[PDB]
Write a protein that binds this DNA or RNA. Structure first.
Ligand SMILES: [Mg+2]
Ligand SMILES: [Mg+2]
Ligand SMILES: [Mg+2]
Lengths: 94, 410, 121, 45, 50, 282, 125
RNA sequence: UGACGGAGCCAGCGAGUCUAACCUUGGCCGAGAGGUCUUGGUAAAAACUCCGUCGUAACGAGGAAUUCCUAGUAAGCGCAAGUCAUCAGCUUGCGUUGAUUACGUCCCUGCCCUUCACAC
RNA sequence: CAUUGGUGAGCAGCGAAGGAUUUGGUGGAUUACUAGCUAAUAGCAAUCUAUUUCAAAGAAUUCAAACUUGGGGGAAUGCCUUGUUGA
């Protein structure tokens, strides 16, 4: 602080770093300052954040990000192979 | 840092690889590209909003980049530097092109026309030069060194007239119509110029506080003594409380610290100026605070196209005779807010479509301005919506042809 | 120094302090950590004041002369005139120390070499 | 000498610049010996 | 060595370096008593001896 | 810019001269570190040096690519301009294009009436990393100089046995992937210096299955430069020449841009010394 | 002292130094009248300032231009730039600033190169 | 879009007591070495502007194919230097005059990449 | 030939009981004008002070009080804290 003020804040920025923050769902009005007005009424967490369609809880079920769910019993064999191959490519990228 | 106002989250943050201080910023109209400049890099860093990746670094300036702006229509990027030059970057498109334009002195500020066809720059010489972007040739120049009012500081050993401390404008902005420029700097003046005719419409004194250092051009000779200015003597020791007596000032600090750190009086200066998108007003950030100047009161009598026959009495006679269009037009020719309001509310709902279709094109911008200002605080929500519906349907095409005449009203 | 020599925290902060002080110009070299004690002095900070840097850039014949020119409003750093002779100039900002455009000193510099152009002035 | 030329600071100011003069070509002119008033000339004549 | 911090580190390092230096360095140069006034040092020695 | 570049060079030059003075100090600290770890007695000079022992407490916590290239090594891809001498012949223009294709991020620029100070100043403004200038004798390339911006070094080579790809019929088009690099038989410090200069002309991080390889093979100070395309077979590798062939011999290396003829020479070829033939410097 | 101003015009290697002072309308280039400037085909080029602002303004000043370096065309452009800059500077220093603004407006409207140097610095691509 | 002659006139690089021919005819002096003189042959800024005169065996601006090229760029003109590699059957610099056409497209040909809000 | 170098000798032109340059002192402004003193609900302004004294009220265990120190290492004798001895 002292050196920055001495140099009239012409310093060289610090090296960048990454840190984690926790955001708690709350009404957007609370985050604002205290006055007889509010600007936004939404929630602090987006709908994706509250719920993301993920891996199927049941083993026999297959669930995708788009929300489509298929049980392994109903899938035809050609579809099982197609989904298995699609699984391989996704894993290979990651 | 990008901020999302609906949820108040810093949804993204951009940073250069070499950790450079950023002093200016520009955002694409599409909101998909962000460019920032620095006073120690000489390059313009560009980021992608969706990804956060540094798309590219624009090079070519031989001095620090002082300011940036995207064209709202053409989407070109205009940058100016202390390199005494201006460069127009066509970053979008298959081929990247740069068009440098030379200027007589260091460029301190830059404003982009809403049309996107011209750019104005304030130079260290106290000049506002307007250039044509497509043709890259100068189209106007406004001299401003004489207009600027700069005060002598208590610590200065040289006169204000000979002082070259701030005789230039560090910030400028167009009016949304495109016919006026409002300028400010590290000086006690805000000057409002008219672009097409290159004249000073008006000058505003930012402050009249003798506490601020730069207010006065001439200082009282009684303060001067054999020791020096009586003001420069520090009277902190006289204060009774210890906290007031403590001096935490660093020897050479000029900026970026608390007031206790500086040890010198605050200096009257305007950091930024802008026009109101929706009203005939402008706001200037200064030391004391954000001054807002507006034309709301409208006590002035500024008639348009009067004749002897036009009179406040005559307008009321037209209303009683049920000549609504003539009553409304004569009210506009007088340009009296109360008379416009009286005629506006006296037109029956059945007659609104007939009147709206028959209003002359010259008075169309005036009615739209009145409705917007009147509707925001009035209680007649439905009546105003009926009028707006009639006006847009009747003269929607005309407003489209002239977007910048009707921008603030719309 | 009293932290263990192999500590990652010790090495990080010591380099950061060396990085910052060199940028200000207080420290001439970044190589040796011992410089933070031996070569950190008031003279090192005073040597970065505007009058001294003018003297080293040969803008003035003496530090006293440089102070007078600053007090007389001939010196600007970037676009800002500075009449404070205690302004500390970082290494990056030493490039922008120069005379004011309408300074009588600039005219003498250009007039001496017969390179004065009155269009600029 | 070339390095001195390249590293020259355009803003270097010396008080002697007033007394010293430069030719049209750009070279320093040096007086061989370092004008006479009429009263001096009348006595010499 | 990695765990030790504080004055223990500073006093440990100095003791080690003095031990190594004693072999080849001249006795006068390697060890020098810090300058103290006589009336203080004689007082310090007397109290320590007690 | 010009003021900033000038000061940065002076600070860089000043830093070096201090480092040469500090080299003795660094070795002294190494002796102290060894003695503490091993327990052996210190030498007499170190034993009586009280200042160094005090300094050692702060300097105990102290720990490659060349200094010019260290800042951007593996971070920013190079930007290269390939140019020629004034009024180049048709063959030199063709060869300059081949060198342009050799480096992934090279751009060919016409040198008609460009001045050398103007050329380097223009390239420094645009962020160019290296500049390649080619010379010829009656349509035969003879020399190749590589100037690394903003402050050097400038390495000059003489080309022999040049076989351009234009001399090949039905050769086809080149592949422009980021190529793999082979630097064979570079041992001496000068050899490492040359390798660092040549390595940084290419993009960092080629794909593992990249099918293009560029090899610089040192054979008695004559670096053979070849470009090959390979296909991994079931029992080995099969390669094919893509060209061009040429052998480049370093004869000068200066610490500055090619414009500055006054730049201090890092290394030069002494041809008339009596023992010139015996030793190979690279 | 006689009020005088000095200006430079430059085009490639050609450099022209213009000295503008109070006088009686005496325009000379390299010690000869402006009417003798060569090549004749480009003579009106060097006349362009004199005609654009009118000869009446020059009736109260003397201009002396000395040109060195470059070829014929670049020398002509240096002369015209120097003349325009000298006139503007003289009207700035020893006449009202209103006339300065009018002169600058006229010169910039006709050809901005009269005032600002036309420098074709290389731009790599 | 000529030749001849005259006139006018415009550059930037470059400065080691270092810069530089050959073969003959003969006089004189000199012990010689050689010195001096005499003699014939061979070799070894331009563009630009103005004015005056004449006058419109091989080859008369180069086929098929193929290559290169985007602004102080292509092309024209001359002047210097020869910088430990290369170069004089030439090489590298320097200035002067200075354009036409594109600055769009993935249609063809190759190379390459992919499969933290709001809105989509 | 050019001096936009110095020093002089003179015209044209301007031109009402002279003109030009430099400098010391004081006065008025440089913030927006409701009068002087005191023991001040009134006296004085020529002061009284020969009524100017009494009465009433008025004293936090805050009985706390360096927010005030350039860095490293100590501090014999001092000083601070804590216990302890004998009155
Ligand atoms: Mg060419
Ligand atoms: Mg040539
Ligand atoms: Mg060549």
């Amino acid at each position: 602080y002292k050196l920055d003020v001495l140099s009239s804040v012409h310093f060289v920025p610090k090296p960048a770093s990454t840190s984690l923050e926790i955001r708690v769902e709350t009404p957007t009005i609370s985050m604002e300052d205290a006055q007889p007005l509010y600007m936004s009424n939404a929630s602090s967490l987006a709908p994706q954040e509250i719920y993301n369609v993920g891996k199927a809880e049941k083993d026999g079920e297959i669930r995708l990000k788009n929300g489509v769910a298929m049980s392994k019993e109903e899938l035809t064999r050609e579809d099982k192979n197609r989904l298995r191959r699609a699984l391989k490519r996704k894993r290979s990228k990651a | 840092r990008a901020w999302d106002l609906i949820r108040y989250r810093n949804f993204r943050t951009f940073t250069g690889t070499e950790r450079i201080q950023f002093n200016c910023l520009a955002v694409d109209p599409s909101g998909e590209v962000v460019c920032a400049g620095s006073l120690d890099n000489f390059d313009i860093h560009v980021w992608s909003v969706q990804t956060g990746q540094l798309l590219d670094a624009l090079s070519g300036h031989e001095g620090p980049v002082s300011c940036l702006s995207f064209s709202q229509e053409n989407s070109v990027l205009a940058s100016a530097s202390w390199d005494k030059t201006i460069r127009i970057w066509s970053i979008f498109g298959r081929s990247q092109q740069v068009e440098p334009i030379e200027v007589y002195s260091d460029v301190l500020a830059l404003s982009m026309r809403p049309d996107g066809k011209e750019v104005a720059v304030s130079t260290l010489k106290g000049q506002i030069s307007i250039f044509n972007i497509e043709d890259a040739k100068q189209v106007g120049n406004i001299d401003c060194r004489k207009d600027i009012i700069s005060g002598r500081f208590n610590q200065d050993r040289f006169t204000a007239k000979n002082s070259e401390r701030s005789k230039f404008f560090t910030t400028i902005h167009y009016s949304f119509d495109g016919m006026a420029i409002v300028a400010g700097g590290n000086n006690n003046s805000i000057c409002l110029y008219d672009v097409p005719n290159e004249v000073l419409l008006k000058r505003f004194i930012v402050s009249r506080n003798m506490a601020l250092n730069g207010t006065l051009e001439f200082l009282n000779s009684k303060k001067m003594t054999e020791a020096g200015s009586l003001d420069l003597i520090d009277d902190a020791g006289e204060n009774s409380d210890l906290e007031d007596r403590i001096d935490n000032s660093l020897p050479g600090s000029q900026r970026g610290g608390d007031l206790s750190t500086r040890k010198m009086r605050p200096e009257v200066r305007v950091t930024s100026v802008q026009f109101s998108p929706t009203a005939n007003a402008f706001a200037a950030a200064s030391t004391e605070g954000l001054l807002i100047y507006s034309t709301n009161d409208t006590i002035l009598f500024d008639p348009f196209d009067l004749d002897v026959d036009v009179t406040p009495h005559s307008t009321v006679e037209a209303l009683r005779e049920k000549q609504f269009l003539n009553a409304l037009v004569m009210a506009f020719r007088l340009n009296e807010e109360y008379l416009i309001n009286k005629v506006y509310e006296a037109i029956p709902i059945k007659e609104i479509p007939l009147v709206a279709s028959n209003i002359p094109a010259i008075y169309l911008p005036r009615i739209l301005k009145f409705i917007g200002d009147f509707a925001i605080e009035s209680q007649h929500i439905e009546f105003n919506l009926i009028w707006i519906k009639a006006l847009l349907s009747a003269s929607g095409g005309y407003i489209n042809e002239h977007k910048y005449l009707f921008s603030t009203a719309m | 120094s009293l932290l263990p020599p192999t500590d990652p925290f010790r090495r990080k902060h010591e380099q950061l302090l060396l990085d910052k002080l060199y940028a200000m110009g207080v420290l001439t070299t970044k190589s040796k950590i011992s410089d933070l004690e031996n070569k950190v002095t008031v003279s090192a900070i005073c040597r970065r004041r505007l009058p001294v840097i003018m003297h080293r850039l040969k803008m003035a014949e003496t530090i006293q002369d440089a102070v007078k020119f600053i007090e007389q409003g001939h010196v600007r750093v970037g676009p800002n005139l500075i009449n404070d002779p205690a302004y500390l100039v970082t290494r990056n900002m030493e490039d922008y120390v120069t005379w004011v455009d309408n300074s009588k000193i600039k005219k003498t510099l250009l007039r001496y070499r017969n390179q004065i152009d009155d269009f600029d002035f | 000498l070339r390095e001195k030329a390249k590293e020259r600071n355009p803003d270097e100011y010396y008080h002697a610049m007033h007394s010293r003069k430069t030719d049209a070509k750009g070279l320093l002119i040096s007086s061989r010996h370092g004008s006479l008033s009429m009263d001096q000339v009348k006595l010499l004549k | 060595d990695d765990q030790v911090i504080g004055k223990a580190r500073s006093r440990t390092l100095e003791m080690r370096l003095n031990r190594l230096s004693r072999v080849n360095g001249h006795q006068d140069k390697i060890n020098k008593l810090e300058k103290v006034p006589m009336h203080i040092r004689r007082g310090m020695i007397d109290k320590h001896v007690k | 810019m010009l003021r900033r570049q000038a000061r940065e060079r002076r600070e860089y030059l000043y830093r070096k001269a201090q480092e040469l003075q500090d080299s003795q100090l660094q070795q002294k600290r190494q002796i102290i570190k060894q003695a503490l770890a091993q327990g052996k007695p210190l030498p007499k000079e170190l034993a009586e040096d009280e200042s160094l022992q005090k300094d050692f407490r702060y300097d105990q916590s102290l720990k490659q690519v060349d200094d010019e290239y260290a800042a951007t090594s593996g971070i920013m891809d190079p930007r290269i301009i390939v140019t020629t001498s004034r009024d180049p012949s048709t063959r030199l223009s063709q060869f300059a294009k081949e060198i342009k294709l050799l480096f992934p991020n090279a751009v060919r620029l016409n040198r008609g009436n460009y001045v050398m100070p103007n050329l380097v100043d223009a390239c420094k403004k645009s962020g160019t990393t290296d500049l390649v200038v080619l010379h010829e004798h009656r349509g035969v390339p003879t020399s190749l100089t590589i100037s690394h911006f903003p402050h050097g070094p400038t390495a000059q080579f003489s080309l022999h046995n040049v076989v351009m790809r234009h001399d090949i019929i039905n050769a086809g088009n080149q592949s422009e992937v980021n190529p793999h690099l082979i630097f064979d038989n570079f041992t001496t410090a000068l050899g490492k210096r040359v390798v660092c200069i040549l390595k940084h002309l290419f993009n960092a991080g080629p794909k593992k299955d990249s099918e293009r390889v560029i090899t610089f093979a040192n054979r008695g100070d004559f670096i053979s430069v070849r470009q090959h395309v390979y296909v991994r077979t079931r029992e080995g590798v099969e390669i094919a020449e893509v060209g061009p062939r040429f052998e480049m011999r370093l004869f000068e290396l200066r610490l500055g841009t090619l414009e500055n003829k006054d730049a201090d020479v890092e290394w030069q070829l002494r041809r008339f010394i009596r023992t010139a033939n015996k030793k190979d410097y690279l | 002292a006689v009020p005088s101003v000095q200006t430079f015009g430059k085009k490639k290697s050609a450099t022209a130094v213009a000295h503008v002072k109070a006088g009686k309308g005496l325009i000379k280039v390299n010690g000869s009248p402006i009417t003798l400037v060569e090549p004749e085909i480009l003579r009106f080029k060097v006349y362009e300032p004199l005609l654009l602002v009118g000869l009446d303004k020059f009736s109260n000043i003397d201009i002396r231009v000395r040109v060195t370096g470059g070829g014929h065309v670049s020398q002509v452009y240096a002369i015209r730039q120097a003349i325009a800059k000298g006139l503007v500077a003289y009207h700035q220093k020893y006449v009202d600033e209103q006339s300065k603004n009018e002169l600058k407006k006229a010169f910039t409207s006709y050809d901005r190169t009269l005032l600002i140097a036309d420098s074709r610095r290389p731009e790599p691509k």
